[PDB]
Amino acid sequence: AYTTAQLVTAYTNANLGKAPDAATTLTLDAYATQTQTGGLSDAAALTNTLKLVNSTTAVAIQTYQFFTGVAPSAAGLDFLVDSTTNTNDLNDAYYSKFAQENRFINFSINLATGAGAGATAFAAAYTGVSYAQTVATAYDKIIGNAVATAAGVDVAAAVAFLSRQANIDYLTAFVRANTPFTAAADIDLAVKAALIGTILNAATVSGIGGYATATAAMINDLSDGALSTDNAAGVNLFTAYP
Amino acid sequence: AYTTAQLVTAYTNANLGKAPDAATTLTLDAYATQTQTGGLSDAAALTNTLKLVNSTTAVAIQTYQFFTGVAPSAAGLDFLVDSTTNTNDLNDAYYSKFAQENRFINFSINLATGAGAGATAFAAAYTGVSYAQTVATAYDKIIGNAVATAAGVDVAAAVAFLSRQANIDYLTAFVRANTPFTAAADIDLAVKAALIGTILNAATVSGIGGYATATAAMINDLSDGALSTDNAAGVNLFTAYP
Ligand SMILES: [Ca+2]
Ligand SMILES: [Ca+2]
Ligand SMILES: [Ca+2]
Ligand SMILES: [Ca+2]
Ligand SMILES: [Ho]
Ligand SMILES: [Ho]
């Protein structure tokens, strides 16, 4: 049985020192009183609390891992999510009009195609490969292929959907309008980055797959105030949380 | 098998020393003779007896808990329900023309928006949140969300109903006419209080949910004359009756 004052501290540390909105406080409060009456177990309540930190935090853990091969350190996460120094950060003013999806896409393009940390590596790996393959391989990397089928979701129907011509056209226009790219190669390259972003979203929302399960465990460890692993130059998810 | 003289004592202590009306005596009598013939079990008869004390007592236990975080002590309950000192009390002359519903609404507005004990806390918690969210979160706090679905009642249909525009308009007029509030903020705040009141009624009438089940157990303990928990400065329902 959690006091409503414990669930807010668990939420605050997950959000890296951002105190919850008035609205969400009421949501947390419901989860507390549903544990005092035994209409909800303890572990269940805590998971739902940490589910609310998806947009702010999970966006920074997941994308960094996929592109640079390592999740940011606790100190680094602070900078990306909730800081004094970064004027514009994930739980700040700039981003308050981006949905969950457009947050993932934003982070992806940044890290991948710009002067970002992942640019040189992602540029060499995904050159001269088709949209179809980009999606298929990435789907398997993130969500697994075996795991998805066991979970009951049909892989073939999902991959086809993401790579249909209508989808590609939508992104092409999106990337052309928003990003300062004009070259034919860089636009192509950025579209791929946006697709992988879309997949990361689709992963974290369903809870299936390796990426989603590890990120959940990192946020759980981060909940209590102190991150156990906390290597100075980044934590590799798959090493630390088996 | 209960003698009709035992069911009246069980009713009297639940009502805190108010002896039942002529009409209800006849109802209790039926419940007695239905236990002597074995057309009704013992526990069943006693529950129905205590179901009749809903309007008078359950109104004071439930509302106090929701707004001040603690049900009133036995001594306090006496004051609210059936006393010499309080000229106007729940089972007295003032309230004899209020239905069950309007009793809940009355108590809510008192405790929440006035100079009542809950004013300062409720004022800070429910400021700058919409009608929709007020209802949704409160529904879950009181009735549970998981519990309701298992019980078979569809949550979405019920919450939508409570927050439909027609409902809000009815209350707005109601609050404006009855309460001495003229400010635009206080009226807004009082409407929310009235909604939560409506939900408390809807809870106690169906028997579903954490709030309703605990209040039933407190009344059962109060039935025999002596309240076991009886902390001087209030009994927290969810601690005392697991
Ligand atoms: Ca900032
Ligand atoms: Ca930890
Ligand atoms: Ca009196
Ligand atoms: Ca007792
Ligand atoms: Ho922070
Ligand atoms: Ho009394």
Numbering used by the authors:
A (entry chain A), B (entry chain A): 2 to 243
Task: Provide the authors' original text about this structure.
Furthermore, cryoelectron microscopy (cryo-EM) and cryoelectron tomography (cryo-ET) investigations have demonstrated that binding of RsaA to lipopolysaccharide (LPS) molecules on the C. crescentus cell surface is also regulated by Ca2+ ions (von Kügelgen et al., 2020). Based on previous structural biology data, full-length RsaA has been predicted to contain 22 putative Ca2+-binding sites; 19 in RsaACTD (Bharat et al., 2017) (numbered 1–19) and three in RsaANTD (numbered 20–22) (von Kügelgen et al., 2020). To verify the Ca2+-binding sites in RsaANTD, we reconstituted the RsaANTD:PS (RsaA bound to the O-antigen oligosaccharide of LPS) complex (von Kügelgen et al., 2020) in vitro, in the presence of Ho3+ ions. Ho3+ has a high propensity to replace Ca2+ ions (Weis et al., 1991) and we wanted to use this property to spatially confirm the location of Ca2+ ions in each RsaANTD monomer. We performed cryo-EM single-particle analysis of the reconstituted complex, producing a 4.3-Å resolution map. Comparing this Ho3+-bound cryo-EM structure with a Ca2+-bound structure solved previously (von Kügelgen et al., 2020) showed strong densities in the region of one of the proposed Ca2+-binding sites. The proximity between this Ca2+ ion and the previously resolved LPS-binding pocket suggests that it might play a role in stabilizing the RsaANTD:PS complex, in line with previous results (von Kügelgen et al., 2020). (A) Density map of RsaANTD:PS complex supplemented with 5 mM Ho3+ before vitrification shown as black mesh at a contour level of 20 σ. Site 21 in RsaANTD could be replaced with Ho3+ and observed with single-particle cryo-EM, suggesting strongly that it is a Ca2+-binding site. Since all three proposed Ca2+ ion sites (sites 20–22) in RsaANTD were stable in MD simulations, we expect that these are probably also true Ca2+-binding sites, with sites 20 and 22 having less propensity to be replaced by Ho3+ under the conditions used, or Ho3+ is not capable of substituting for Ca2+ in these sites.
Surface layers (S-layers) are proteinaceous crystalline coats that constitute the outermost component of most prokaryotic cell envelopes. In cells of the bacterial species Caulobacter crescentus (also known as Caulobacter vibrioides), the S-layer is composed of a single 1,026-amino acid residue SLP called RsaA (Smit et al., 1992). RsaA has a canonical bipartite arrangement, with a lattice-forming C-terminal domain (RsaACTD), consisting of residues 251–1,026, and a cell-anchoring N-terminal domain (RsaANTD), consisting of residues 1–250. The assembly of the RsaA S-layer is divalent metal-ion dependent (Nomellini et al., 1997; Bharat et al., 2017; Herrmann et al., 2020), as, without divalent metal ions, S-layer formation is inhibited both in vitro and on cells (Bharat et al., 2017).
